[PDB]
Structure 1
Amino acid sequence: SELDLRKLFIDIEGIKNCWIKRERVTVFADLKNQKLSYEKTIWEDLKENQKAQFDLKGLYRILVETEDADKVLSESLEKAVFTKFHANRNLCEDLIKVEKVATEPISVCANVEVAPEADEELIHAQILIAIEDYLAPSPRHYSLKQMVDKGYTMDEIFEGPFLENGFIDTVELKASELRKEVRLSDIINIIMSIDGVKIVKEITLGNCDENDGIENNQWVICIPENKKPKLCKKTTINYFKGILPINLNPVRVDNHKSKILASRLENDLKAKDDLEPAIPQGTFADWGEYSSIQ
C-alpha cells in the first residue's frame, strides 16, 4: 500500500519524509490506421473523430525530503530508493523517477508584546520552531513499550512491514501530507500560545516575493499541488515590553533552538533497543521416565 511504501523509504538514513505520486504517461492513437505513439504527430491528416488517447495505469514518482538541505539528492539516496522499490514491488507496477521535493516560500512578519519578566531569546526560538513544524510536520520513531503505552495491540503494532529503526505511527504518517493552503488564524494561535506572549499587535502573511509593496492581507495562501511550503528567511518579529522595543542577541537563540532539536535526535535513536516482546521459557527433564510398580 501507499502508507507501507512511505514507511519503507522513510527509514533510509538521511530521509525525513516521502510522498508517492503517480505518473501519467500519454499515448496517442490513429483510429484510421491503427497506430500509436507518444507524439501527437500520430494524428497528422486525421479527422476529428479518428483520434484517441490513453493514459498509463501503474507508474510511480517518488518525492523525497532530506536532512541535508542541499539542492539535489545524493546519488547514494537515489540508489537506495530504487533498490528498495525494485526489491519489494507489486505485480504490474514500476518506478520511473526519484527526485527531491519542490518548495514554495512564505513570509511572516509581526509585532509581539511579551511579559516584563520573560526570556525573549527563548520565546523567539520556541515561536520559530512551532511555525516551522506547522508548515511541514514529520513522524517520529517509537519503542515497543511506547506503542503499548499508546494503547495499540499486537495485531496493530505489527500490521505493516517490519521496521529496523523503531515503530512508526500510522496517524502521524497520514497527518504529514503536503499542505495545500496557509492561513493566518492558525499562525496567530501558535504565537499566542507561547508562554510569555501577551499581545500580537501586528501580523501579516504573504507570498514571499520581490517589490513587496502595498498588497492584500492574504488571510489564506494556497500552495501548488506538488510543493512543500517553507519560511522564506526574510521573516521577522519585533519584540516589545510595554512600549519599548527590545533587541535579541543573535547567538543565544541558536543555542536554544539547537537544544530543542537535540532531544529529537536522541529520542529516535533510543527506539532501536526495544523491538520485540518476551516469550515464557521452560526447562527440560525427560518427562517419560518410568519406574516399575514391582
Structure 2
Amino acid sequence: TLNKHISIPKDMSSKDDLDFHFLREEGIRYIKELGSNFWTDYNTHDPGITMLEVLCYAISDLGNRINIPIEDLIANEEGGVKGQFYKVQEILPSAPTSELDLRKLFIDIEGIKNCWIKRERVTVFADLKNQKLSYEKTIWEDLKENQKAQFDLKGLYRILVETEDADKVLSESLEKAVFTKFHANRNLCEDLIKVEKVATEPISVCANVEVAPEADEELIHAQILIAIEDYLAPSPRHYSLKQMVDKGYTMDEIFEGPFLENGFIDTVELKASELRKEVRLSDIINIIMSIDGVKIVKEITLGNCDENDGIENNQWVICIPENKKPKLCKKTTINYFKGILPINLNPVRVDNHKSKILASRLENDLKAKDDLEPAIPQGTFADWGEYSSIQHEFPETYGISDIGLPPKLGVKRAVLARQLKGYLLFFDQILASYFEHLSKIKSLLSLDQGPSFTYFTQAIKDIKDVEELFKDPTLLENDEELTKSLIGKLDDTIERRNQLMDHLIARFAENFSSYAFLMKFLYGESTDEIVLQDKQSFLREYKEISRER
C-alpha cells in the first residue's frame, strides 16, 4: 500500500481506434479505392487530407472515454449504486426454512445460549365403523379390533431453550420473543405449540489428581472444571466477517442462511452442539490429563448423581434420556496432591480464575457485532458525454474559428466560410450522438426505470452561428425534440426495449415469455405498452419476490 514510481510505455502501437497513425493510413487507403479517379493529390497542403487528420484525432478521443472503468461510468451524483445493483446483504440471504436456520434465528435472542427444535406427535383416534374421530380412545368404545385406527399429526413444533439466567423457568419475555419470531417467519402448513426450558440430568465426577511440584493448583482446578462443563454442553460463538474469511469460507457460504444482526454463526459448531446422549470416562480422563501441570490421575469415577450413593458399578458409560441435557451435579470433587501430600485450595482464587477465563469470551461475541459487510469500490462523476466541435481544430486561415475572418478579405470569402461550417456539421452531429449515448448507459440498464428511447442526440452550441445555420433554432433548446426530429422512426423502441428488459430479467434466471401471448386474450395492440410496464415492475420488486416464498 505504498506509492510506486510512475512511467509511460514506449511502444505506442495498437492497430486499433486509439492509434492515430494506423487510422490515418486506413483513411488514405479507403480514399484511393473509392475516389482516385478524381482525387489524386494527397499532399499535406490539401484541405481534404487536413479534414481527415482532424477526424482521426476526434476518433481517438471517443475511444479513450469508452475505456473509462465502470465504477465511474455508472456512478451516481450522490455516490452509491441504488438503481444499478442489489447488494450481497440484500440479494444473497434466505428466509429461514430449515432446522439449522431456526436454531440460528432464535439463538440470537439475547439471554438464549442454545435451542433445539423438536416435533410434536398429536394423536387422533378413529372409529372405522362409524366414521368419527377424537383425541380420546373413548372413540373406540364397543368396537371390534379391526375397526380401530390412529393417525399422527405431521407439522407441529416444540422449542427447547437453554438460557443464561439459570432460573427454573423461562421469562415470559423470552416466550414472547420466540413465539413472535416463529410466527413472523414460518413455513406453509406448519405451527408452533410450545416453547419451554430444556430439562436436565445430573452427573457426578470424583477424582484424585497428582500435579507438578511447581504448579498453580487454583488455576488448574478452574481450567479442569471449565473443560468438563464444555464437554457436557457445548455452545456456538459469534464471528466477525473478517474471521469468517480467515476460516476459509467464501461469500456464497457466509451469506447462505438468514442474515444475523449479531455476527456470523458457523454451521459446524451449530451441528456439533446437539444434546449429548452418552458420557464416558475415556473422554473425561483425557480432559484432565491434558491440563498443564497434571501428572497422574490416581483415582477417577463417574456416576449418576443420586442419594444413597454406596457401593456401585464403575459406569464406564452413562446414557442420557432423549430430551435432556447433562449437567454436573455440584456434589463433585477433586483431591489434589503433590507427591504424597494433600494440599488445600481457596475458593476466592478459583472463582477469580474461572471468571476471567469466561469473561474474555463475551468480549469477542460483542466485537463480532460491528464487522458485518464487505466493501464496494466507489467512483466519481463527470458528465462523460461532454463534446467539443471539430471546427475548433482548423487554422484561422479557414475562417471557421471564434475570432472570425478579417473584413479586408471581402464578403465572398466570408460566405464560403459559412458554406464550410454547414458541411462540417454532418460530421459533428454524428460524433455528438456517440458521446451522448455514453451518458445514457445508466438509464438503459436501470433497475428502477428505463428510458423511452434507445438512440440519442445533442444540440451543438459551441459554434457561433448555429442559430442561422439551422432552419428552426427551436430544436436546439431541447435535446428530446431534436432526437425525435433527427433520428425519429429509425429508433425501433418496442423491440429494442424488450431485448434490454429480457437480458436484465435473465440475470436472475427468470422468464416472461408467456406474456407474449397470454396478454392477447385480454388486450389487443395495447399489450406492447402493458407488457413493458409489467417487466419493469417485476425487476423493482424482485428482492422480496425471490425471498419470501
What's the TM-score once normalised by structure 2's chain length?
0.54
Rounded Cα–Cα distance in structure 2 between residues aligned with 1:285 and 1:52: 77
Q: Identify the structure with the greater helix proportion.
A: 2
Q: Identify the structure with the greater strand proportion.
A: 1
- Match of 1:118, SS state, is coil
Rounded Cα–Cα distance in structure 2 between residues aligned with 1:201 and 1:170: 39
Q: RCO greater where, 1 or 2, for CA within 8 Å and sep 6 or more?
A: 1
Rounded Cα–Cα distance in structure 1 between residues aligned with 2:268 and 2:358: 22
Rounded Cα–Cα distance in structure 1 between residues aligned with 2:139 and 2:346: 66
Equivalent residue pairs, number: 294
Q: Deviation per CA, 1:217-272, whole angstroms, max 9, x where unpaired? A: 00000000000000000000000000000000111000000000010111100001
Structure 2, unpaired ranges of 5+: 1-97, 392-549
Q: Deviation per CA, 1:86-105, whole angstroms, max 9, x where unpaired? A: 00000000000000000000
Match of 1:9 in 2: 106
Rounded Cα–Cα distance in structure 1 between residues aligned with 2:165 and 2:154: 33
Are 1:112 and 2:209 matched, yes or no? yes
1:72-91 correspondence to structure 2 within 5 Å: 72-91=169-188
Q: Deviation per CA, 1:195-233, whole angstroms, max 9, x where unpaired? A: 000000000000000000000000000000000000000
Rounded Cα–Cα distance in structure 2 between residues aligned with 1:286 and 1:69: 64
Rounded Cα–Cα distance in structure 1 between residues aligned with 2:364 and 2:387: 57
Rounded Cα–Cα distance in structure 2 between residues aligned with 1:262 and 1:105: 25
- Match of 1:103, SS state, is strand
Please report how far the alpha carbon of residue 21 of structure 1 lies from its aligned counterpart in structure 2 after TM superposition: 0.0
Q: Deviation per CA, 1:111-145, whole angstroms, max 9, x where unpaired? A: 00000000000000000000000000000000000
- Match of 2:165, SS state, is coil
Please report how far the alpha carbon of residue 59 of structure 1 lies from its aligned counterpart in structure 2 after TM superposition: 0.0
Rounded Cα–Cα distance in structure 1 between residues aligned with 2:200 and 2:369: 32
Rounded Cα–Cα distance in structure 2 between residues aligned with 1:117 and 1:187: 24
Rounded Cα–Cα distance in structure 2 between residues aligned with 1:161 and 1:249: 47
Are 1:100 and 2:197 matched, yes or no? yes
- Match of 1:289, SS state, is coil
Rounded Cα–Cα distance in structure 2 between residues aligned with 1:249 and 1:81: 42
Please report how far the alpha carbon of residue 146 of structure 1 lies from its aligned counterpart in structure 2 after TM superposition: 0.0
Find 2:156's aligned residue among 59, 63, 66.
59
- Match of 1:105, SS state, is strand
Rounded Cα–Cα distance in structure 1 between residues aligned with 2:115 and 2:369: 21
Please report how far the alpha carbon of residue 288 of structure 1 lies from its aligned counterpart in structure 2 after TM superposition: 0.0
Please report how far the alpha carbon of residue 66 of structure 1 lies from its aligned counterpart in structure 2 after TM superposition: 0.0
Rounded Cα–Cα distance in structure 1 between residues aligned with 2:331 and 2:387: 87
Larger Rg: 2
- Match of 2:390, SS state, is coil
Find 2:278's aligned residue among 181, 201, 223.
181
Please report how far the alpha carbon of residue 3 of structure 1 lies from its aligned counterpart in structure 2 after TM superposition: 0.0
Structure 1, unpaired ranges of 5+: none
Rounded Cα–Cα distance in structure 1 between residues aligned with 2:258 and 2:123: 33
Rounded Cα–Cα distance in structure 2 between residues aligned with 1:14 and 1:94: 24
Please report how far the alpha carbon of residue 167 of structure 1 lies from its aligned counterpart in structure 2 after TM superposition: 0.0
Rounded Cα–Cα distance in structure 1 between residues aligned with 2:128 and 2:278: 43
Please report how far the alpha carbon of residue 58 of structure 1 lies from its aligned counterpart in structure 2 after TM superposition: 0.0
What's the TM-score once normalised by structure 1's chain length?
1.00
Rounded Cα–Cα distance in structure 1 between residues aligned with 2:227 and 2:326: 14
- Match of 2:378, SS state, is coil
Rounded Cα–Cα distance in structure 2 between residues aligned with 1:54 and 1:81: 29
Match of 1:264 in 2: 361
* Structure 1 residue ranges, 4+ long, deviating more than 2 angstroms after superposition: none
- Once superposed, what is the RMSD of the aligned Cα atoms? 0.2
Rounded Cα–Cα distance in structure 1 between residues aligned with 2:201 and 2:307: 14
Q: Deviation per CA, 1:31-62, whole angstroms, max 9, x where unpaired? A: 00000000000000000000000000000000
Rounded Cα–Cα distance in structure 1 between residues aligned with 2:272 and 2:359: 23
Rounded Cα–Cα distance in structure 2 between residues aligned with 1:252 and 1:114: 18
Match of 2:127 in 1: 30
Are 1:42 and 2:161 matched, yes or no? no
Rounded Cα–Cα distance in structure 2 between residues aligned with 1:272 and 1:102: 31
What percentage of aligned pairs have identical amino acids?
Answer: 100
Are 1:209 and 2:311 matched, yes or no? no
Please report how far the alpha carbon of residue 163 of structure 1 lies from its aligned counterpart in structure 2 after TM superposition: 0.0
